[PDB]
């Protein structure tokens, strides 16, 4: 049994990239990845990670600033299906500002502005970008299907 993505305590949205498969982005306080690794030494896994993230950037038309910043992250695969977990650092205004030039923040600002969440707030405005503040501890991405997007798929 795995926890739900479509829950009252979470925010979620599903990107359909092709007829069958897509990405489910989930803001939650439950984590699915125990470790803190992102073993991408194989070229094929490193490219599936690039492609999941590219499909989010193009659909949301994200323009991520370069601030020499970095969001804590673990990743993992289950038979070619990626699971990416960001351990967010945006609980304060200072933390939101220091983790602003990241894919996580651009995603969250899309949730805030499409009203898919109420727990996202503005912090600092810089370079035409909004730094997002939130109490959510994780942002989860999984390569999944439309029929399963409401339940977290097994990561490994
Ligand atoms: C979701 O996962 C699949 C599997 O990793 C991704 O792509 C295809 O996977 C098959 C193996 O089942 C490979 O033989 C193909 O070469 C892969 N195609 C591509 C274009 O990479 C699929 O792209 C993933 N979807 C998302 C949205 O990340
Ligand atoms: C997530 O966890 C933080 C505590 O770290 C809490 O303040 C926040 O309200 C929680 N949000 C949800 C939706 O449970
Ligand atoms: C990356 O994953 C492979 C798969 O087993 C593993 O052998 C390798 O040691 C990992 N990378 C590092 C630096 O350990």
Residue numbers in the entry: 80 to 235
Paper text:
Similarly to GP1LCMV-Fc, GP1MORV-Fc did not pull down LAMP1 from HEK293T cells, nor did it interact with recombinant LAMP1 immobilized on a sensor chip. We obtained crystals of GP1MORV (residues 73 to 235) at pH 4.0. The asymmetric unit contained a total of 16 copies of GP1MORV, mostly differing in the extent of electron density observed for their N-linked glycans, which in some cases were stabilized by a nearby protein molecule. GP1MORV has a central β–sheet made of five β-strands, flanked by the domain termini on one side and helices and loops on the other. The global structure of GP1MORV is similar to the previously determined structure of GP1LASV. The histidine triad in GP1MORV (His91, His92, and His228 according to GPCMORV numbering) adopts the same conformation as the triad in GP1LASV. GPCMORV has a β-hairpin made of two β-strands (β5 & β6) stabilized by a disulfide bridge (D3) against α3. This β-hairpin is divergent in sequence and was previously termed the variable region of GP1LASV. GP1LASV has a strong positive charge in the vicinity of the triad, whereas this charge on the GP1MORV surface seems milder. Overall, the structure of GP1MORV does not reveal major global structural differences that could account to the inability to bind LAMP1.
LASV has a surface-displayed class-I trimeric glycoprotein spike complex that mediates receptor recognition and fusion of the viral and host-cell membranes at acidic pH. The spike complex consists of three copies of a single polypeptide chain that is cleaved twice to give a structured signal peptide, a receptor-binding module (GP1), and a trans-membrane module (GP2). We previously showed that a triad of histidines on GP1 is important for binding LAMP1, and we further demonstrated that the binding of LAMP1 triggers the spike of LASV to catalyze membrane fusion by potentiating its response to pH. We present a crystal structure of the GP1 domain from the Morogoro (MORV) OW mammarenavirus, which does not interact with LAMP1, and conduct a comparative structural analysis between GP1 of MORV and LASV (GP1MORV and GP1LASV, respectively) to identify structural differences related to the ability to bind LAMP1.
